[PDB]
Design a protein around this nucleic acid. Sequence first.
RNA 1: GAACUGCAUCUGAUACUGUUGAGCUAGAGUAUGUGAGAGGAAGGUAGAAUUCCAGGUGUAGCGGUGAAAUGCGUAGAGAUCUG
Length: 115
Amino acid sequence: SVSEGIAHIHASFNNTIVTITDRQGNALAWATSGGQGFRGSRKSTPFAAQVAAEVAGKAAQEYGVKNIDVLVKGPGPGRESAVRALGALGYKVNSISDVTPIPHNGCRAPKKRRV
RNA sequence: GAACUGCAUCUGAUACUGUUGAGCUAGAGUAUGUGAGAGGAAGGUAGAAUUCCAGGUGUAGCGGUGAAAUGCGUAGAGAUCUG
C-alpha cells in the first residue's frame, strides 16, 4: 500500500516504543519491549528494543514499506539497538533523525529523588 | 616637713585643640563628551516544552520501580499526525 514510511523509536529509561507509520502519521504497526515477554529490568535493555523493532518492522513489512526514516526520541538505551534491527531486517533507511522534546526552560521538573 | 593630683583669680606662651577673618586645591562635589551592564518600573510579543479539549491512524498495553503495586487502558490507552 505504502512504500515510504516513518519509524518512531520513542525510548524511555523504562520502556521503548517502536511504532512505524507512513509519511503522513497514520500508524501501521507498533511493538514494545514490555509486550514481548520482557518485564522489569529486562524490559529496559537494548536487546529488548532489538526484538521490539524486529517484531514491529516485520509486522508492517507486509504493508509494502521499504523506504523509511527513523525518528528517535528519548534517553533510553534502546535508541541505538532498535535502529540496528531495522537495518538488518531488510529496510532501506532514508534518514536517521533525533527529534527529542527539549524545553527552553519551561515547566518545572519533579523534585530530585532521595535514593 | 612633704603631700593633699584639686578649686579659684591674675599674668605670661601660642606648638596643638576651640572660636574667628582672608586665601588655596590635594578630600568631596558640579557642567560637558563617550561606554558597559540579568540595575529598577510599566506594557507588548516570540519560540520550544508540559497539561487539557476535539478529531485521524492503530492495537494491547502504558506508566512506574531496586523490584513491584496503586494508577491509566478494550467506554480504545500509550505511541503518531492535525487543530
